[PDB]
Amino acid sequence: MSKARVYADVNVLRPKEYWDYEALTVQWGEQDDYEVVRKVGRGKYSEVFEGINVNNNEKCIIKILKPVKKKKIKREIKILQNLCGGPNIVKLLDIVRDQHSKTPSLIFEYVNNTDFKVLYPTLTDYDIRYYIYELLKALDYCHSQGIMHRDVKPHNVMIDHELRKLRLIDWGLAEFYHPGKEYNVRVASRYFKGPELLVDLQDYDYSLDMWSLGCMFAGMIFRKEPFFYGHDNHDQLVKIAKVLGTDGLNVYLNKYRIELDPQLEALVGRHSRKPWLKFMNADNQHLVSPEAIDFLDKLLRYDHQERLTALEAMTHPYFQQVRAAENSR
Numbered sequence: 001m002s003k004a005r006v007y008a009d010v011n012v013l014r015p016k017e018y019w020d021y022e023a024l025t026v027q028w029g030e031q032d033d034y035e036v037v038r039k040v041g042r043g044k045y046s047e048v049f050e051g052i053n054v055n056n057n058e059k060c061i062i063k064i065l066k067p068v069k070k071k072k073i074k075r076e077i078k079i080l081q082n083l084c085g086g087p088n089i090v091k092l093l094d095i096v097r098d099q100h101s102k103t104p105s106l107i108f109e110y111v112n113n114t115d116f117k118v119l120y121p122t123l124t125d126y127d128i129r130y131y132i133y134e135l136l137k138a139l140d141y142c143h144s145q146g147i148m149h150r151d152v153k154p155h156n157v158m159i160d161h162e163l164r165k166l167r168l169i170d171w172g173l174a175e176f177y178h179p180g181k182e183y184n185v186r187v188a189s190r191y192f193k194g195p196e197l198l199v200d201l202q203d204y205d206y207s208l209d210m211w212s213l214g215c216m217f218a219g220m221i222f223r224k225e226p227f228f229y230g231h232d233n234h235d236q237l238v239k240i241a242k243v244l245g246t247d248g249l250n251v252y253l254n255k256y257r258i259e260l261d262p263q264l265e266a267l268v269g270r271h272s273r274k275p276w277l278k279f280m281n282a283d284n285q286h287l288v289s290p291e292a293i294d295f296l297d298k299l300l301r302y303d304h305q306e307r308l309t310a311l312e313a314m315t316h317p318y319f320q321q322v323r324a325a326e327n328s329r
């Protein structure tokens with residue numbers, strides 16, 4: 001029992017050719033056009049390398065999918081094609097065929113990539129507001145286009161601290177939102193899983209990405225990543241319940257008349273709420289501001305419907321200075 005408080009009819013008002021990724025036909029490119037130049041990472045069921053080009057001869061990114069169903073490949077490509085152009089979203093340049101074995105390869109643009117395991121700890125109070133903001137612009141866009149990312153995490157938020165640039169990547173788990181549809185809950189990463197996924201409220205929506213965002217943010221301001229250090233889907237809910245309090249979860253479970261399975265309810269037991277301020281400590285005092293906490297507090301709400309929307313969040317007084325810089329440039 002749930003609907004999206006915003007952009008719900010986006011796909012209901014658009015041409016079937018928009019969200020029906022199955023009825024797609026890939027206009028592959030020439031493998032010859034691209035050559036691997038240096039591996040650079042991993043992207044969940046996909047190896048990634050820094051490559052070159054067709055005739056431009058410029059840096060790019062080659063993501064050789066890990067042979068999954070033809071189904072998910074159309075999905076990722078389609079969604080990327082719909083989001084091509086939006087603020088801070090990764091732009092797809094090509095979609096060649098399998099040079100080697102079993103899969104095709106997506107060609108993007110060079111993202112000078114930097115590390116959140118070393119970057120984040122150096123970020124200043126203002127650098128955060130700035131990037132979370134830029135990320136928000138990216139989320140409000142895909143959401144405005146009826147698409148949920150479903151895998152927001154530090155890793156899929158590549159920042160170029162030098163160019164002050166940010167890009168949202170890996171839309172391999174992304175999906176089109178349709179009113180009242182029940183999606184699978186085996187999405188995103190555990191530490192950023194919204195409670196909905198953990199109680200099995202399948203008719204979720206864009207608001208899922210906002211919870212994940214909240215998890216990143218928290219790990220940023222409190223300097224404790226991951227913030228919800230769960231050891232498995234069940235312990236993820238407990239690790240959360242131990243912070244937000246079980247009272248909140250009970251109200252949540254009733255509202256959506258969802259019954260928590262045995263073995264899960266016991267493992268969650270009953271815990272009081274923990275004031276955000278109790279996570280403050282030396283290493284994170286220069287970032288934990290009343291405004292930050294308030295913003296964080298409005299992102300991490302059991303009830304997905306209670307969470308802020310990408311658009312609402314960008315107007316929060318917390319980002320007030322970041323905004324006051326674009327209306328001046």
Ligand SMILES: Cc1cc(O)c2c(c1)C(=O)c1cc(O)cc(O)c1C2=O
Pocket residue numbers: 040041042043044046048061063090108109111113158169170171172
């Ligand atoms: C869909 C998608 C688009 C991308 O542009 C990247 C990735 C995925 C990705 O997984 C990735 C991993 C990495 O370690 C470095 C990157 O620059 C990347 C990427 O740039």
